[PDB]
Amino acid sequence: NNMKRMLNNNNMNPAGANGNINNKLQHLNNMNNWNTQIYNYNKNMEIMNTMNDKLINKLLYKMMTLKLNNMNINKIIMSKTINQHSLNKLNIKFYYYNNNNNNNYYMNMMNKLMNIMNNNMNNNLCNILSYYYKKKVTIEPIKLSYIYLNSDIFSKYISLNDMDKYNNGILTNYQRMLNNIMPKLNDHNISMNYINNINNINNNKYNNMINLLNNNNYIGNINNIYNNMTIDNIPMDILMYKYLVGWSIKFKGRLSNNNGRTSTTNLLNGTFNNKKYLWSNINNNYKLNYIPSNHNLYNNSNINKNGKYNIKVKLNFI
């Protein structure tokens, strides 16, 4: 009875079995729903800060496109920035995409731009930002190797770069490429496997606790509780979102040279329901109380010769 009581007191684990919690690798922090991660007691000041942040975003967007002697215009796509306002310091951060060992000996335009953000001793952009906020700023770029890992980047890139493929109409090859980005992953199978792995982990911890046990609720040493639990085994299995299960991309507006009317054209793949939440302890949560956590929706509206159009993107991520 004492042993049972001790177990009950210590019974905690990663959520997702059928005494458990959602770990920081199993769900998003609701702070990562907003883009200006701040609280100030004077709300005027907070408003001023969020205005500043918004203005800096525009500036960053402007910077992102370079030129090379009027030969090549490499348009680096960037995500919407997320500004982390700690008491000590601001930290701006964004995800970005850029399209033999010969380039160890010259600085690329993108590289130069990235260096400008933090490395130029006095001249750097972070230093200049610090005057607007009255605290040390740190811009961290994060490179994405694919166009479709971030939703904003995906939508933005298609808006800016791939004009010719959809201006008159969506070219067949381009559409095919869009369709067959991902390899049609059995999302049901993956979610179920993840759940099984979580169950196994829980059993392992429980087994260890039992082994230790053979009015105070202290078990044995840490090494014996977490016997088989390590950095190599657990973290990557527990990591929640990893697999772009399903995605929808919508082109809309005057994307027809002959026609006067508009054209809604939608590409759909995979699924947008998550089966990890359907049969387990882990529950779905809503970002800004209206977007299922796993979803991420975005649009970007480039102007054409004919007028305005936009490109919705929506990915699922198991």
């Binding site: 702070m31 907003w34 991660q37 701040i38 609280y39 700690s86 008491l87 040493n221 840490i222 090494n223």
Partner: protein, 186 residues
Amino acid sequence: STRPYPVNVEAVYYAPLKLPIKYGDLVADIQLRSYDNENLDFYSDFILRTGYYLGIPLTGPKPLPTRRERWTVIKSPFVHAKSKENFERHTHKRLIRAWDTNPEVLQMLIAYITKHSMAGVGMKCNFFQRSEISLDLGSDANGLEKSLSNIDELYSLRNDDKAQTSAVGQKVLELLDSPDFKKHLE
């Protein structure tokens, strides 16, 4: 498995320790506001840990009631005023209270907290100074000199074994040391 995990690691893995309160001489209370929980709770836990280790009997995250700033808005850009949408914002509030500490230790704690602060969390501190009734700022120069000596004692490099150093702090110390600074008052 012949791998000695020392006590600090164990403490990290378990809940944070709290020192008992000898006397109810509330020295400082620290309120933590944020627009969500997960970061805030973590930060509070971290504050408790630092308070305990080289610490001042901190009580713990007493949740003060959350606010609710509501705002309603017509969904459309034009007319359809029968359809309206709500919006809300919850200011989550937690209280820490330090109970018995010599001011310097409390300052250090607070300074440490603000150094390794988290993203979403704002902070406010109410410090309390139990002073005597009658006071005097007449015997001045000597008191200034004493204060400077105390500062010097506080910020002395004991052993330069690649310790944490600050350029601005060094500059401040140099300014405090200077003859010009001493002259200021008289």
